């Protein structure tokens, strides 16, 4: 803790808040990238209310 | 109006159908009772979860079949549901087994 410091905060225009934002997208890709890709679930598909009453 | 048979006929030990036909089928299920003449009007088919005694959908109708008609069930029989809207309930006819 600081006592006598009166540095000028900025919540909003931080650098970091920005840098959050990115990391969310990485982990995906390179979680995302070496797994299965699915272009042929584009095949048409027939679809009907369910078994019920 | 519910559209019900109010009479029908089966011989010492065939199988039978009643047909309640309408517009309401295609949405809620189909709920029966047995009124002998006087009687309670006793249930037979209910929905406990989404024997002798059946009823089968199909499309503006749903056929009750039933199935080993010894002469106690002679009775007057009554098709029940539900009309679209969820609010008020009625009954159809009134089909004497012979």
Not at chain 1, 3 to 27: A, G, P
Not at chain 2, 14 to 28: H, M, N, V, Y
Not at chain 2, 31 to 44: D, E, F, N, S, T
């Amino acid at each position: 803790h600081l006592e006598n410091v009166t540095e000028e905060f900025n919540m909003w225009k931080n650098n970091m808040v920005e840098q959050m934002h990115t990391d969310i997208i990485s982990l995906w890709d390179q979680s995302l990238k070496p797994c299965v890709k699915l272009t042929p679930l584009c095949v048409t598909l027939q679809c009907t209310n369910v078994t019920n009453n | 109006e519910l559209t019900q048979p109010p009479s029908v006929s089966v011989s010492p030990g065939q199988t039978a159908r009643i047909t309640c036909s309408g517009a309401p089928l295609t949405s809620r299920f189909t709920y029966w009772y047995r009124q002998k003449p006087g009687q309670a009007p006793v249930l037979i088919i209910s929905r406990s979860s989404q024997g002798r005694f059946s009823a089968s959908w199909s499309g503006t109708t749903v056929t009750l079949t039933i199935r080993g008609v010894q002469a106690d069930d002679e009775a007057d029989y009554y098709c029940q549901s539900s009309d679209t809207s969820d609010s008020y309930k009625m009954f159809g006819g009134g089909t004497k087994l012979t």
